[PDB]
């Protein structure tokens, strides 16, 4: 993350990092919504352009981690996936639309002080909280400065990175790019004439854009880091998958319904 502070120990118990088995590298960030379901961005698994198409045999889920590389023997829980559900009408070629995915764990994890899930939006919270101007916290171990042929010169961060970015009016997100923006993705970031910087970069993708409810006092995942046009570029904002606008598909896939 570009222009952020260091996350506190336990500041985000729902963070997950899609680790690659071999070679062992950080693919993306993820989010825990149940003891056996993990939410990510559909491009972290399926992206024909970058020849991306992982199997369940490719992935390894790391939960409760606060170091980038360090195997936290006593606090991080590693798990393995079972199935991988990618949205059917995912637009990986015209605008990365419906960029959301769900991974089922082959084992409900032992929830600790560090492994503790996020809440999904309810009609009221989506309505009350999701207002242009309202800030949303985004976490992730990705790039601290936009890089093409990437890697360390202190670009990647040691521990979790946090940054709170305000939401942008839709007409401004649309008039920010040339890509067909739908109502299945919103954008966030400080305007050029604004007094602050920051943004999600490469490696943070998949990660949760959360918001703390003021009426209720719990956290709500309002989006998932989908894509941006360069990290922290004046006049360009970060796009996130609208979690609430795609919630039905989450219910329809998890089947955690009426009771």
């Amino acid at each position: 993350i570009v222009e952020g502070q260091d996350a506190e120990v336990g500041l985000s118990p729902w963070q997950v990092m899609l680790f690659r088995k071999s070679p062992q590298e950080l693919l993306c960030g993820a989010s825990l919504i149940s003891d056996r379901w993990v939410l990510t961005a559909a491009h972290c698994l399926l992206y024909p352009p970058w020849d991306k198409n992982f199997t369940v045999d490719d992935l390894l889920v790391r939960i409760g981690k606060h170091s980038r590389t360090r195997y936290e023997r006593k606090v991080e829980k590693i798990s393995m996936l079972d199935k991988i559900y990618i949205h059917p009408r995912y637009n990986w070629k015209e605008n990365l639309d419906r960029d959301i995915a769900l991974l089922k764990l082959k084992r409900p994890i032992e929830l600790s002080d560090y492994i503790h899930p996020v809440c999904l939006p309810d009609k009221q919270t989506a309505a009350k909280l999701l207002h242009a101007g309202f800030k949303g916290r985004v976490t992730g171990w990705g790039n601290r400065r936009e890089t093409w042929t990437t890697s360390v010169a202190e670009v990647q961060p040691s521990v979790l990175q946090v940054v709170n970015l305000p939401l942008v009016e839709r007409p401004v997100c649309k008039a920010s790019t040339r890509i067909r923006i739908t109502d299945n993705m919103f954008c966030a970031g400080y305007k050029p004439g604004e007094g602050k910087r920051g943004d999600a970069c490469e490696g943070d993708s998949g990660g949760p854009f959360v918001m703390k409810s003021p009426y209720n006092n719990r956290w709500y995942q309002m989006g998932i880091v989908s894509w941006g046009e360069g990290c922290d570029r004046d006049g360009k904002y970060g796009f996130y998958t609208h979690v609430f606008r795609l919630k039905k598909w989450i219910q329809k896939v998890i089947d955690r319904l009426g009771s």
Partner: peptide, 15 residues
């Protein structure tokens, strides 16, 4: 997305 080596993990994940 690339590599600045990552520390050891219990290999019954790898095999």
């Amino acid at each position: 997305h690339n590599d600045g080596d990552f520390e050891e993990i219990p290999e019954e994940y790898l095999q």
